[PDB]
Write a protein that binds this ligand. Structure first.
Ligand SMILES: CC(C)(O)c1ncc([S@](N)(=O)=NC(=O)Nc2c3c(cc4c2CCC4)CCC3)s1
Ligand SMILES: Nc1ncnc2c1ncn2[C@@H]1O[C@H](COP(=O)(O)OP(=O)(O)O)[C@@H](O)[C@H]1O
Length: 476
């Protein structure tokens, strides 16, 4: 009662910003598989028995973290689940070690402000607890389905993977509620652990909310209308801006153009990322940024210490400049890239830099949870390897290595196409990034039949481009 008040006050302060003012928050579209947040845990016709597990699947950059942080803030302010949950515990998955031994009590205490929380009091009513697991796909290391034995004691220290598996399977605090957010790529791994989950999909920004975002980002109404009109004129940007991270990336780059006229002709997500990074260029620490990202991807480190950045040649003034440029993020003496997609962009760039590791071993670990799935590393490799595209940033890349990698990617597509890791639609996202018709046409010939499941206008745009470049050699 008195501790619940002290805890709620702490949650209200630490969840006030997107960075850690939640007035820049724009409503995200959620669908059940127009769901009202307050009714998420209500049974439909489950004879009055509530739903204890809710899974929010959402693409990278769709706003899973922002939605989870808004949920924490709304609840702490008495706006959400006021009469349903005494406690909401935010489990930031990227900070949870899968090997360190810890109890569920230690985990709950790590979410508390003070060193001595009344853990026995908190756990007295498990059904009044909602565990908000943000970013299942961001748990560093392997998350094996065979792990065990399962734990049924909230006080027992277990390896992080056994602890989280026991919690997800509802072995530990069986009637506590659980809200897990994940990229659709990890849904395969997660579904095996889930007990009667309610599945919800985060679709991102509607066309109306895309405009709303641009108008909220730009203080000047004239600048907001000019930036939104640019997006309306460009099919690719208009279509990609359903992803709130893309809205932020585009708005940020257009802001610098406004300082110095508005024109963005980006046709791929690689073009969008290069356009953004080019706006920060006044670059010296490119080999250091790329090696840091590649080391963090291959060795599973999303949070870096001051010691980690020092190992890659990033001094005090450099880490402060990257923080100001919105390339680095300050997290709880820990640093990370502003988004995991940027860490994967610099990891892809590491393989092409001229002064570079083996792309064959990288492709062997593609689609593995242990490595983060390497979706954007591979997509950005297809994009950056495109010779028909250049910039000052891309001039630092080697044409010799890019030509070798281009041949390896074509041989990789051939095997995937000729023979469940990269779907056919995922190969289309890769080919769409490549853009270059000779490669695209050669790769499209490897497919014996087109078998795709389209869900979004982005899926249609990408697959339609690939199918238009899939014409039989003999045809006409
Ligand atoms: C295709 C399928 C089912 O295999 C996947 N669906 C979602 C994913 S993922 N990697 O989890 N998210 C994403 O692709 N996001 C993105 C991102 C950008 C652009 C686009 C998308 C998706 C559309 C264009 C830039 C920043 C993140 S993979
Ligand atoms: N609803 C939203 N309103 C405003 N900005 C948002 C929203 N959702 C996401 N963003 C923007 O997108 C970025 C990435 O969102 P995030 O939730 O971290 O993505 P994900 O968790 O899906 O990987 C945020 O840093 C912010 O700039």
């Amino acid at each position: 009662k008195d501790y619940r008040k002290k805890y709620r006050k702490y949650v209200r302060s630490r969840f006030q910003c997107i960075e850690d003012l939640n007035k820049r928050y724009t409503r995200l579209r959620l669908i059940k598989e127009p769901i009202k947040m307050e009714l998420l845990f209500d049974p439909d016709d489950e004879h009055s028995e509530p739903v204890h597990t809710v899974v929010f699947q959402g693409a990278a950059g769709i706003g899973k973290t922002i939605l989870a942080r808004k949920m924490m803030l709304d609840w702490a302010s008495g706006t959400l689940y006021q009469d349903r949950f005494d406690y909401l515990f935010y489990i930031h998955c990227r900070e949870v070690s899968l090997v360190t031994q810890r109890s569920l009590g230690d985990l709950i205490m790590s979410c508390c402000p003070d060193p001595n929380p009344p853990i026995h009091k908190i756990v007295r009513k498990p059904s009044r607890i909602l565990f908000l697991m943000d970013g299942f796909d961001e748990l560093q290391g392997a998350f094996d389905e065979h792990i065990g034995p399962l734990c049924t004691d909230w006080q027992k220290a277990e390896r992080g993977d056994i602890l989280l598996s026991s919690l997800i399977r509802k072995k530990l605090l069986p009637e506590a509620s659980l809200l897990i957010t994940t990229r659709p790529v990890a849904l395969e791994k997660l579904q095996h652990l889930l007990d009667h989950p309610r599945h919800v999909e985060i679709l991102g920004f509607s066309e109306a909310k895309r405009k709303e975002y641009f108008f909220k980002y730009f203080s000047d109404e004239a600048q907001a209308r000019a930036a939104f009109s640019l997006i309306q004129e460009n099919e690719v940007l208009f279509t990609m801006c359903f992803i709130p991270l893309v809205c932020w990336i585009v708005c940020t780059g257009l802001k610098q153009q406004m300082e110095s006229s508005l024109a963005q002709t980006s046709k791929t997500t690689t073009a969008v990322y290069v356009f953004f990074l080019s706006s920060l260029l006044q670059c010296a620490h490119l080999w250091g940024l790329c090696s840091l990202a590649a080391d963090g991807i291959w060795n599973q480190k999303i949070l870096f210490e001051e010691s980690d950045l020092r190992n890659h040649g990033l001094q005090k003034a450099d880490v402060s400049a990257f923080l100001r440029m919105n390339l680095f993020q300050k997290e709880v003496k820990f640093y990370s890239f502003i988004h995991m997609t940027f860490q994967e962009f610099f990891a892809a760039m590491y393989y092409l830099l001229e002064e570079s590791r083996d792309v064959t071993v990288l492709l062997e670990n593609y689609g593995k949870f242990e490595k983060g799935y390497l979706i954007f590393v591979v997509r950005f490799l297809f994009g950056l390897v495109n010779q028909e595209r250049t910039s000052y940033l891309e001039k630092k890349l080697s044409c010799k290595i890019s030509q070798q990698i281009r041949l390896e990617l074509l041989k990789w597509i051939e095997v995937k196409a000729k023979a469940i890791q990269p779907s056919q639609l995922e190969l289309f996202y890769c080919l769409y990034e490549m853009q270059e018709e000779d490669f695209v046409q050669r790769a499209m010939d490897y497919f014996p039949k087109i078998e795709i499941n389209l869900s979004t206008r982005m899926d249609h745009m990408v697959s339609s481009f690939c199918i238009e470049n899939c014409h039989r050699v003999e045809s006409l």
